[PDB]
Amino acid sequence: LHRNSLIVLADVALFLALYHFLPFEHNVVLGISMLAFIAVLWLTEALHVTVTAILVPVMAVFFGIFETQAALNNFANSIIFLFLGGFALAAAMHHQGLDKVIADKVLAMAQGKMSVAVFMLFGVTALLSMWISNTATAAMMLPLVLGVLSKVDADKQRSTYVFVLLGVAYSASIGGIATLVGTGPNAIAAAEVGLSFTDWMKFGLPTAMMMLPMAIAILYFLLKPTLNGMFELDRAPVNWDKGKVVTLGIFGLTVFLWIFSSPINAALGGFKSFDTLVALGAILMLSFARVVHWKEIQKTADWGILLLFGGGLCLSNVLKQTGTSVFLANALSDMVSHMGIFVVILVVATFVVFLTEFTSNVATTTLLIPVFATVAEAFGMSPVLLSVLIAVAASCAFMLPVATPPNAIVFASGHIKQSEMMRVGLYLNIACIGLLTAIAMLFWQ
Amino acid sequence: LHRNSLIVLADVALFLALYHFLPFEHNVVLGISMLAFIAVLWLTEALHVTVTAILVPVMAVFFGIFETQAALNNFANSIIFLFLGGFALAAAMHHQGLDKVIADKVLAMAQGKMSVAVFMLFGVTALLSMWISNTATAAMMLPLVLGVLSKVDADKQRSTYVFVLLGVAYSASIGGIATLVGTGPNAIAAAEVGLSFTDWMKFGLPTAMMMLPMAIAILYFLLKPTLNGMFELDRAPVNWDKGKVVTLGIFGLTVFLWIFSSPINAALGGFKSFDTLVALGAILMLSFARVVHWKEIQKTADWGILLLFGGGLCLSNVLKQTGTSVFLANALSDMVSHMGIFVVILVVATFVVFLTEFTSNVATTTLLIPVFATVAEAFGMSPVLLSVLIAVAASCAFMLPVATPPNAIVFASGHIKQSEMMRVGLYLNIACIGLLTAIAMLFWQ
Ligand code: NA
Ligand code: NA
Ligand code: NA
Ligand code: NA
Contact B237, B243 (CB under 8 A): no
User: Which of B108, B111, B146 is CA-nearest to residue B124?
Assistant: B108
Count of all residues that appear for chain A in the document:
445
Residue B194 gets the label, from left (phi > 0), alpha (psi -120 to 50) or beta, of left
Distances B340 to A36, B20, B92, B336, B435 between C-alpha atoms, Å: 62, 36, 47, 7, 18
How was this structure determined? It was done by X-ray
- Write A233-239 long-range contacts (CB < 8 A, 24+): A233/A108, A233/A112, A234/A147, A235/A147, A237/A104, A237/A108, A238/A97, A238/A100, A238/A101, A238/A104, A238/A105, A239/A101
A293 φ, ψ (degrees, to nearest 5): -80, 170
Chain B contact for A243, CB < 8 A? no
Give long-range contacts, CB 8 A cutoff, 24+ apart: A410-419. A410/A138, A410/A142, A410/A145, A410/A165, A410/A166, A410/A168, A410/A169, A411/A169, A413/A142, A413/A146, A413/A165, A415/A155, A415/A158, A415/A161, A415/A162, A415/A165, A416/A162, A416/A165, A416/A166
Q: How many distinct helices (H) and strands (E) make up chain B?
A: 23, 0
Instruction: Determine contact, residues B390/B372, Cβ cutoff 8 Å.
Output: yes
Does residue B250 belong to the interface with chain A, where contact is any CB pair within 8 Å? Answer: no
Which amino acid does the sequence have at B392?
V
From chain B, pick out residues whose CB is under 8 angstroms from the CB of A4: 290
Query: Are A81 and B72 an interchain contact pair (Cβ–Cβ within 8 Å)?
Result: yes
For residue A165, the one-letter residue type is L
DSSP state of B417: -
- Listed residues: CB within 5 A of ion ligand 2: A 356, 361, 397, 403-404
Contact across the interface for A74 and B69, Cβ inside 8 Å? no
d(CA A181, CA B162): 51
Enumerate residues 6+ apart whose C-beta is below 8 A from B79.
B180, B187, B190, B191, B273, B276, B309
d(CA B41, CA B48): 8
Query: Which of B4, B5, B38, B58 is the mutation pick for testing A, counting most A CBs within 10 A?
Result: B58
Residues with CB under 5 A from ligand 4 (ion): B 356, 361, 397, 403
For residue A176, the CA-to-ligand 1 centroid distance in Å is 3
Contact, A58 vs B280, CB < 8 A? Answer: yes
B114 and B231 in contact (C-beta within 8 Å)? yes
Q: Which residue, among B63, B22, B57, B23, has the nearest Cα to B38 in the 3D structure?
A: B57
In angstroms, the Cα distances linking A159 to A217, A223, A224, A246, A417 are 15, 6, 6, 41, 11
Of B54, B74, B290, the CB nearest to A5: B290
| Residues of chain B positioned with their CB less than 8 A from the CB of A273 | 68-69
Between CA A22 and CA A35 the distance in angstroms is 13
Q: Separation of B359 CA from ligand 3 center, angstroms?
A: 18
| DSSP-assigned letters across all residues of B59-86 | HHHHTTSS-HHHHHGGGG-HHHHHHHHH
In the three-class reduction of DSSP (H, G, I as helix; E, B as strand; rest coil), residue A243 is classed as coil
CA A103 – CA A262 distance, rounded (Å): 32
**Interatomic CA distance for residues B207 and A188, integer angstroms:** 46
Q: Which residues, at least 6 apart from A121, have a Cβ–Cβ distance to it below 8 Å?
A: A107, A141, A144, A145, A148, A164, A167, A168, A171
CA distances from B344 to B318, B336, B349 (A): 25, 7, 9
Which chain A residues are Cβ-neighbours of B304 within 8 angstroms?
294, 298
* Interchain pair B76, A72: CB under 8 A: yes
**Closest by alpha carbon to A279, among A54, A91, A101?**
A91
Rounded Cα–Cα distance for residues A54 and A48 (Å): 10
> Chain B residues with CB inside 8 Å of A2's CB?
290
Contact A272 B61 (CB under 8 A): yes
Burial of A396 (0-12, 13-18, 19+ CB in 10 A): buried
| Nearest CA distance, B403 vs chain A (angstrom) | 19
* Residue pairs spanning A and B at CB distance below 8 A: 117
Residue A290 sits at the chain B interface (C-beta within 8 Å): yes
Question: Mutation test of the interface with chain A: which of B73, B74, B290, B300, choosing the one with the most A Cβ atoms within 10 A?
Answer: B73
Distance in angstroms (rounded) separating the CA atoms of residues B373 and B380: 10
Distance, CA of A412 to CA of A169 (rounded, Å): 12
**Distance from chain centroid for Cα A220:** 25
Handedness of CA A18, A22, A27, A32 (dihedral sign): negative
- Sequence-distant (≥ 6) Cβ neighbours of residue A53 within 8 angstroms: A307, A308, A309, A310, A311, A312, A366
Q: Residue A189 in contact with residue A179, Cβ under 8 Å?
A: no
Ligand 1 centroid to residue A41 C-alpha, Å: 25
The number of folded domains in chain B is 1
- Output Rg (C-alpha) for chain A, integer angstroms: 23
B contact residues 6-45, partner A, Cβ 8 Å cutoff: 8
Residues near A362 by Cβ (< 8 Å), separated by ≥ 6?
Answer: A49, A183, A184, A185, A188, A305, A308, A394
Q: Directed axis angle between helix B341-358 and helix B418-442, to 10°?
A: 150
Are A170 and A145 spatial neighbours (Cβ–Cβ below 8 Å)? no
Cα separation of A211 and A206, whole Å?
Answer: 9
| Residue numbers of the domain that contains B131 | 1-445
DSSP H helix total and E strand total for chain A? 23, 0
| C-alpha closest to that of B37 among B65, B62, B9 | B9
Neighbours of B260 (CB within 10 A): 12
Asked if B76 lies within 8 A of A73 by C-beta distance, the reply is yes
Q: Which of A277, A304, A310 sits opposite B61 (nearest CB)?
A: A277
Using an 8 Å CB-CB cutoff, list chain B residues near A69: 77-78, 272-273
Amino acid at B43: L
Contact B288 A47 (CB under 8 A): yes
Reference A107, options A245, A249, A214, A237; nearest CA is A237
Cβ contacts of residue A313 below 8 Å, gap of 6+?
Answer: A74, A75, A77, A188, A191, A192, A370
Say how many CA atoms lie within 13 Å of B118 toward its Cβ. Answer: 27
**What is the Cα–Cα distance from A383 to A368, expressed in whole angstroms?**
12
CA distance to A185, A334, A416, B254, B289, per residue, from A190 (Å):
9, 29, 36, 37, 35
Q: Which amino acid is at A18?
A: L
The terminus-to-terminus CA distance of chain B in angstroms comes to: 55
Backbone torsions φ then ψ of A237, nearest 5 degrees: -65, 170
Dump strand ranges (E) for A278-436: none
3-state DSSP call for residue A258? helix
Distance CA A189, CA B81 (A): 25
Show the beta-strand stretches assigned E in B368-445: none
Query: Contact, B67 vs B61, CB < 8 A?
Result: yes
Buried b (16+ CB within 10 A) or exposed e, B129-162: bbbbbbbbbbebbbebbeebbeebeeeeebebbb
Which of A133, A228, A220, A146 lies closest to A183 in space, CA to CA?
A133
- Enumerate residues 6+ apart whose C-beta is below 8 A from A162: A223, A415, A416, A420
Contacts of B301 in chain A (CB under 8 A): 303
Handedness of CA B265, B268, B272, B274 (dihedral sign): negative
- Report the C-alpha gap between B96 and B117 in whole angstroms: 24
Q: Return d(Cα A310, Cα A58) in angstroms, integer.
A: 12
In B224-302, where does DSSP find H-type helix? 244-259, 261-266, 274-288, 294-300
Nearest to A278, CA basis, from B305, B310, B62: B62
For B20, B41, B88, the CA distances from B322, given in Å and listed in that order, are 17, 20, 37
Tell me if B73 and A76 make a contact (CB, 8 A cut-off): yes
Residue B268 to chain A, least CA–CA distance (Å) = 10
**Helix/strand/coil percentages in chain B, nearest 5:** 75, 0, 25
Residue B321, C-beta contacts closer than 8 angstroms, at least 6 positions apart: B27, B31, B65, B66
Q: What letter represents residue A296's amino acid?
A: E
Asked whether the beta carbons of B45 and B364 are under 8 A apart, the reply is no
